[PDB]
Ligand SMILES: [O-][O-]
């Protein structure tokens with residue numbers, strides 16, 4: 001397997017505006033098929049990249065900055081990854097979703113607002129070429145990625161991911177590590193052929209002859225871990241505090257991260273922004289689309305090589321030689337200047353300072369059926385994507401969503417537009433629920449850990465539990481979506497429209 005820690009971590013460049021005034025910031029990003037070297041010992045890999053880059057450029061904006069991005073498709077008219085036509089017009093459809101973005105609905109990147117090359121053909125929900133991001137939301141790590149109907153797992157795996165950072169000037173006084181000491185880490189697992197080409201399975205292993213070919217798979221686990229588009233890279237760091245914006249940009253894989261020298265992370269932020277208080281952690285779980293905004297303090301580790309380690313298996317136990325490793329820090333870079341940064345305890349308001357009335361309690365089941373080929377089809381509340389919309393919260397109102405998970409695995413449930421609070425998790429009797437539809441708890445409710453006391457947008461719903469979250473639906477009304485962010489689940493068919501109504 002590929003020799004670990006021989007390539008330096010790329011730092012994606014920050015995208016520069018095409019035009020900028022006090023009133024408006026304008027960016028252009030074109031999707032291009034490109035070549036990139038994923039590891040020292042590999043031939044260059046053919047990939048799809050925002051502006052021909054993998055990951056795409058990092059976009060940095062201020063809170064309330066009035067941003068527009070024209071996302072353009074200049075990709076080949078045929079895909080290079082295996083398309084299964086039985087699960088769902090031009091072959092290559094794309095649309096860019098700003099994950100966590102508080103956007104009008106027609107700039108949100110709806111799966112059916114897709115477009116082919118040069119916008120020649122567009123889906124039924126397409127309205128605009130230029131997307132508008134008013135950024136009227138908390139400072140946070142967002143990320144952008146393809147969201148095209150029935151193609152998301154493929155377009156994302158192909159390379160269409162990037163970081164998008166909202167900076168709230170009100171947080172600047174906290175003196176968190178900044179600029180060169182504030183580094184996105186987009187973590188993507190991949191399987192890569194000897195010739196350097198991406199491998200994505202064309203079918204489950206040992207397919208029943210009943211299966212079509214290609215066939216969608218229910219889960220994808222890559223053999224190799226990349227950070228910022230390089231396989232098992234190293235980052236030379238100065239002996240001081242760094243802020244890392246850790247993004248799970250993987251299709252299926254969940255990580256459980258730790259430092260092999262036993263050092264701590266200081267978590268300062270979750271998907272929806274700064275936590276009310278910093279949380280010292282020795283390890284953390286990170287499912288697809290979750291973000292952890294953390295400080296690592298290397299002050300006391302000069303000279304050391306520290307492995308960012310992973311203990312979470314994907315389809316099997318973690319392998320010490322391969323997926324147990326993410327990247328390596330080498331604390332050998334000379335100090336550019338005095339560490340003027342801080343790791344404060346007091347960060348932001350508690351979400352609980354809000355006293356919203358509960359308009360509605362919405363009960364939602366994670367379930368599944370079997371198609372004519374014998375394949376599992378994962379469904380939210382036993383509905384298909386195309387069934388009439390049922391999740392219709394009223395704009396400006398707060399609901400509790402009670403998410404019932406009787407399946408065998410965790411699903412990272414994601415709502416577009418909003419961030420939300422986590423109320424609790426409670427174990428229930430799965431057999432009894434499956435037999436009778438009755439919910440019988442086998443234990444008391446468990447409130448969220450401090451890491452989940454802030455704002456979340458993608459939340460792990462574990463097997464045999466009811467997860468409750470509270471979300472205020474706004475500030476916009478319109479047509480959005482909610483879904484499992486395991487892309488293989490999302491595409492078949494664990495995704496539903498969400499109408500925020502007026
Ligand atoms: O996908 O959010």
Ligand SMILES: [Cu+2]
Nearest residue numbers: 099145289485
């Ligand atoms: Cu997303």
Ligand SMILES: [Cu+2]
Nearest residue numbers: 099100415416
């Ligand atoms: Cu989203």
Ligand SMILES: [Cu+2]
Nearest residue numbers: 411484486489
């Ligand atoms: Cu799922």
Ligand SMILES: [Cu+2]
Nearest residue numbers: 097147416483
């Ligand atoms: Cu989504």
Ligand SMILES: [O-]
Nearest residue numbers: 099100416417
């Ligand atoms: O989102």
